[PDB]
Amino acid sequence: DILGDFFESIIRDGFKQTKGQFFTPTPIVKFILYALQLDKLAIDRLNN
Amino acid sequence: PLIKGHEKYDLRVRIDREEIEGLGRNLHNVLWGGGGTNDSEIFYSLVNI
Numbered sequence: 001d002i003l004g005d006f007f008e009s010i011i012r013d014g015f016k017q018t019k020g021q022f023f024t025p026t027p028i029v030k031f032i033l034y035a036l037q038l039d040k041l042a043i044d045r046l047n048n
Numbered sequence: 049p050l051i052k053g054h055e056k057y058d059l060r061v062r063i064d065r066e067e068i069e070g071l072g073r074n075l076h077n078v079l080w081g082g083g084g085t086n087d088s089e090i091f092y093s094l095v096n097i
C-alpha cells in the first residue's frame with residue numbers, strides 16, 4: 001500500500017476541487033460507514 | 049425545416065441580451081447535468097458548435 005498514498009498526494013496537489021467537482025469529506029464517509037455497522041455486517045456475513 | 053430565405057421558417061433575427069443570458073445560464077446548467085461534464089469541456093464544445 002504505497003502507490004495509493006502516491007495518488008492521493010497527486011489528488012491533493014493539483015486537482016482544484018472548485019465547486020462543480022467536490023468530494024464528500026472523509027469524516028462524513030467514515031461516519032456513514034460506521035453508522036451502518038458495515039464491519040459488523042461483513043463479519044456476520046462472512047461468519048455465516 | 050428552416051429553409052434559408054423562407055419568409056416564415058427563417059433564422060431568428062433581432063435578439064437581445066436577455067435571451068443570450070438565459071441561454072448561457074441554462075446551457076451551463078443543462079450540459080453540466082449533475083457533474084457529468086467538465087466546465088472546460090463544455091466551453092470548447094460550445095466554441096466548436
Ligand SMILES: Nc1ncnc2c1ncn2[C@@H]1O[C@H](CSCC[C@H](N)C(=O)O)[C@@H](O)[C@H]1O
Nearest residue numbers: 020021022023024025029081082083084085
Ligand atoms: N446518473 C448520474 N447523474 C448525475 N451525476 C452522476 C450520475 N451518476 C454518477 N454521477 C456523479 O456523481 C457525482 C456527484 S458528487 C459525487 C459524490 C461525492 N462527491 C463522492 O466523491 O463520493 C458527480 O460528479 C457525477 O459525475
